[PDB]
Amino acid sequence: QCVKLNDGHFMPVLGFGTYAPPEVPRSKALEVTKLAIEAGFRHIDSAHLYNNEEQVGLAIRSKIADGSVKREDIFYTSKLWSTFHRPELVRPALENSLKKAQLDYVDLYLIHSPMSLKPGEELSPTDENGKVIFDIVDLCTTWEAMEKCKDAGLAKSIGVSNFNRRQLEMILNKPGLKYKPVCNQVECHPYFNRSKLLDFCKSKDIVLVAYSALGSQRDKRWVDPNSPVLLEDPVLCALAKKHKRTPALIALRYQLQRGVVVLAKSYNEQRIRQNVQVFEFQLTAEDMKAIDGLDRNLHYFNSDSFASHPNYPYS
Ligand SMILES: NC(=O)c1ccc[n+]([C@@H]2O[C@H](COP(=O)([O-])OP(=O)(O)OC[C@H]3O[C@@H](n4cnc5c(N)ncnc54)[C@H](OP(=O)(O)O)[C@@H]3O)[C@@H](O)[C@H]2O)c1
Numbered sequence: 001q002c003v004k005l006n007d008g009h010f011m012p013v014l015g016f017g018t019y020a021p022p023e024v025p026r027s028k029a030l031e032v033t034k035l036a037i038e039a040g041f042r043h044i045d046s047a048h049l050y051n052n053e054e055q056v057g058l059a060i061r062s063k064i065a066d067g068s069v070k071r072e073d074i075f076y077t078s079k080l081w082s083t084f085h086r087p088e089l090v091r092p093a094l095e096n097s098l099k100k101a102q103l104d105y106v107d108l109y110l111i112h113s114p115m116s117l118k119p120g121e122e123l124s125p126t127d128e129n130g131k132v133i134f135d136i137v138d139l140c141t142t143w144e145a146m147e148k149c150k151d152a153g154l155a156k157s158i159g160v161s162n163f164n165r166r167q168l169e170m171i172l173n174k175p176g177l178k179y180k181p182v183c184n185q186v187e188c189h190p191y192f193n194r195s196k197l198l199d200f201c202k203s204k205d206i207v208l209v210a211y212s213a214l215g216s217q218r219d220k221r222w223v224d225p226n227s228p229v230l231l232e233d234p235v236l237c238a239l240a241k242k243h244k245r246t247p248a249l250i251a252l253r254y255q256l257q258r259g260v261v262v263l264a265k266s267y268n269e270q271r272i273r274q275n276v277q278v279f280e281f282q283l284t285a286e287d288m289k290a291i292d293g294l295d296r297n298l299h300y301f302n303s304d305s306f307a308s309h310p311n312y313p314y315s
């Protein structure tokens with residue numbers, strides 16, 4: 001159950017989301033990554049930002065050592081954080097991710113976000129009035145350094161995340177482009193279905209990878225507590241009743257049938273195992289149209305500061 005990427009590599013269509021907020025002890029990521037692998041997940045999404053690559057990498061080594069999987073059975077994604085966009089910083093950022101995880105390579109490396117931040121050791125650099133410090137970087141140069149990570153064998157595939165159409169075209173029209181982005185990992189769910197971006201991506205052989213596909217973790221630091229709770233949506237619950245599944249399963253299946261590769265974060269053993277049942281049933285064309293009607297241009301992530309950034313993707 002994979003999709004063929006535009007560089008000839010294969011991505012599993014269901015991915016495991018690994019981010020958990022800092023109140024969750026770091027040992028949990030180790031435990032639940034093992035559980036996801038045990039359940040059947042093979043595509044695993046992490047990032048430098050998530051402060052978990054060591055734990056996720058150790059789960060993977062653990063499941064290889066005990067004979068459940070081989071390295072080449074696992075599709076592992078990491079991401080370049082926005083403080084490392086300057087081209088000279090890209091390779092060392094990846095090498096550090098690889099060292100942490102103890103892998104020789106990632107299956108996929110992404111530019112996490114187009115919103116460049118000031119180089120340094122803070123993930124979130126701020127000035128003397130507490131304002132986040134943006135950086136200005138030609139992302140075409142970042143991308144060239146990404147291509148070099150691929151040729152260097154350190155990333156089998158390269159792509160982007162949180163790019164809008166204009167940003168994607170800037171890469172696609174770059175003079176001397178060697179590798180297209182294989183994907184664009186973006187927020188995508190029935191309340192924000194991205195159909196326009198998705199059709200653009202499809203026209204360019206670029207895979208759209210959905211995050212917050214289950215409505216996000218509703219973290220009080222970035223998500224308005226008054227936003228509607230996706231999985232309480234009454235169309236989603238009535239489809240769940242109809243198919244005898246769950247609303248999460250409806251949300252995940254929706255993405256698969258529209259050609260979207262979908263991530264699903266759970267740190268709960270039974271929900272982890274539930275999510276792999278997405279492959280067991282199908283929505284009707286009329287179900288899919290019903291879900292398509294739910295879009296409300298709702299993005300769960302908000303930060304007013306990021307909105308002023310010149311590369312803010314929702315400009
Ligand atoms: N590129 C980016 O900028 C970006 C941004 C955000 C996320 N991501 C990636 O995408 C992953 C997923 O997105 P997300 O973290 O926003 O979460 P999500 O996949 O939208 O899931 C949100 C919540 O749904 C719950 N859930 C999972 N399965 C369930 C089921 N079957 N029934 C009921 N509830 C269920 C989980 O809680 P429990 O843990 O309690 O089950 C989870 O906290 C992330 O972990 C990360 O890998 C990338």
Ligand SMILES: Cc1ccc(S(=O)(=O)NC(=O)NN2C[C@H]3CCC[C@H]3C2)cc1
Binds near residue numbers: 019047049112301
């Ligand atoms: C510190 C922290 C913040 C947020 C999250 S998270 O929001 O749960 N997950 C995620 O990957 N990153 N964010 C979405 C992107 C758009 C803007 C910049 C990026 C940040 C995890 C960890």
